[PDB]
Amino acid sequence: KSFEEKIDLEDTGKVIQVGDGIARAYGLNKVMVSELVEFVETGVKGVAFNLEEDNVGIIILGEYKDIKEGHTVRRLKRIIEVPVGEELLGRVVNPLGEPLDGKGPINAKNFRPIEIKAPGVIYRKPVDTPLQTGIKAIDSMIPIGRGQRELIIGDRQTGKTAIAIDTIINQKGQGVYCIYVAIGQKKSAIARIIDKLRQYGAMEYTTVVVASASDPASLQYIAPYAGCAMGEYFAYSGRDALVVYDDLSKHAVAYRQLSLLMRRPPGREAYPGDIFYLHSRLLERAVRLNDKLGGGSLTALPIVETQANDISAYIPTNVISITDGQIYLEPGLFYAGQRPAINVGLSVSRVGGSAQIKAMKQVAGMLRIDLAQYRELETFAQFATELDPATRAQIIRGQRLMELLKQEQYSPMPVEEQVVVLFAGVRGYLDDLPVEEVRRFEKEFLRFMHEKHQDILDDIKTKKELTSETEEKLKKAIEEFKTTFRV
Ligand SMILES: Nc1ncnc2c1ncn2[C@@H]1O[C@H](COP(=O)(O)OP(=O)(O)OP(=O)(O)O)[C@@H](O)[C@H]1O
Ligand SMILES: [Cl-]
Ligand SMILES: [Mg+2]
């Protein structure tokens, strides 16, 4: 036994490469992803991010300058935890839960691990309650239900963050705790977003997790897992949470950079790319739980950035496949002034449709049909030698409906208002106005409804359907408004 191996290879390891806040270890054969380890000599801790045999990747938490090749590493057998709960509402934190807003310590009473295994179907029940974004295009055509996974995808500067942040702003009074995860964005941009969340009153029920462009890849990589945990605190305690991952494209880039920081062991240059599994694990944690587990939910809104609208690229293909629905944004729409720049024909939300309230179902069906007919006709309309009156009417209706789907940033709309405005459209009441005046008509109409017909809005709101009685009154209110509207 003069030269026998001294260490336990399952729970103990040896640093074989260290630098730029990362280490690679021999041993630690039984370590799991996101498990804490300790560098014995220095007392510093780390978190496992890669389980390659005898080449385990470790994110060093804190001072890495003192860690040397040959140092012993020991499993702590604990998944790294973050503070979660009410104490984080109103706060801006990094992925480890440290405050970044100057408001003092968090003093959290609860903690959760950044990784858990997503519960199986036995623990879930069907999505049955809406998550109102307050954005007409989505709430009508791409309804989201609480517990689902909805992708927001499109090129840079198409309005992706805007949808997400407006959705958050709209959760005031909706009973939804919100977690906004900024991954890889510039500090300056993130600051602006936090300011808007503050200004529009969202921070009361919102936690912002930041790992900026200037933060290490390691923090960017941990960010969404920490954010999910923070949301799970509510989901698993009979409450509803929404977590925004902005964005998973930058997250994939950070995970890739982490892997590239250490060199490959000689004679093995290709370990598999499991970014698909990383995002799959993250998103499966969106859940609609059963009654025995409290009935709460966690809705996920991952964001993916495309290049040249290439939704066939790798990350896009991955996340499209592991989400229940997709909202597609496009630069052509954006540039034409169709904002939000959502392609409502291509976008889809399977699981949300049944959860959508009845009042909205009552107007979304016709909307969808009218837009379908419009887009068919637009195939050839501009090259038609002539179009009959009926066809012209269908085009006009369609142009009016598209105009109604335009909406300014930071202005999410109550569902009952969406309903009466979309009713006016689908029923033809904007057909005789110039298209350029639809926005104003909408603005003036809704003032008019509060001023003279609040009881209609109240009824739709309370009943969540448009009854025949209220429908008739609505028809008359619209006609009444038109009476005085100045074209
Ligand atoms: N509904 C809207 N109406 C008018 N302008 C909007 C709307 N939504 C977003 N914008 C504006 O369009 C621009 C792009 O928005 P945003 O940054 O949310 O898009 P993005 O896809 O997240 O871009 P990035 O690639 O920078 O993350 C911003 O200047 C934003 O203020
Ligand atoms: Cl911990
Ligand atoms: Mg963005």
From Swiss-Prot:
Keywords on record: ATP synthesis, ATP-binding, Cell inner membrane, Cell membrane, CF(1), Hydrogen ion transport, Ion transport, Membrane, Nucleotide-binding, Translocase, Transport
EC number per UniProt: 7.1.2.2
Residues the record marks as site: Required for activity: S347
Primary location: membrane
GO MF: ADP binding; ATP binding; proton-transporting ATP synthase activity, rotational mechanism
A single GO BP: proton motive force-driven ATP synthesis
Cytoplasm listed as a keyword: no
UniProt: ATP binding residues: G154, D155, R156, Q157, T158, G159, K160, T161
Topological category with respect to the lipid bilayer: Peripheral membrane protein
Pfam families: ATP-synt_ab, ATP-synt_ab_C, ATP-synt_ab_N
UniProt similarity note: Belongs to the ATPase alpha/beta chains family.
Assembly description: F-type ATPases have 2 components, CF(1) - the catalytic core - and CF(0) - the membrane proton channel. CF(1) has five subunits: alpha(3), beta(3), gamma(1), delta(1), epsilon(1). CF(0) has three main subunits: a(1), b(2) and c(9-12). The alpha and beta chains form an alternating ring which encloses part of the gamma chain. CF(1) is attached to CF(0) by a central stalk formed by the gamma and epsilon chains, while a peripheral stalk is formed by the delta and b chains.
The protein's name in its UniProt record: ATP synthase subunit alpha
Annotated source species: Thermotoga maritima (strain ATCC 43589 / DSM 3109 / JCM 10099 / NBRC 100826 / MSB8)
Higher taxonomy: Bacteria, Thermotogati, Thermotogota, Thermotogae, Thermotogales
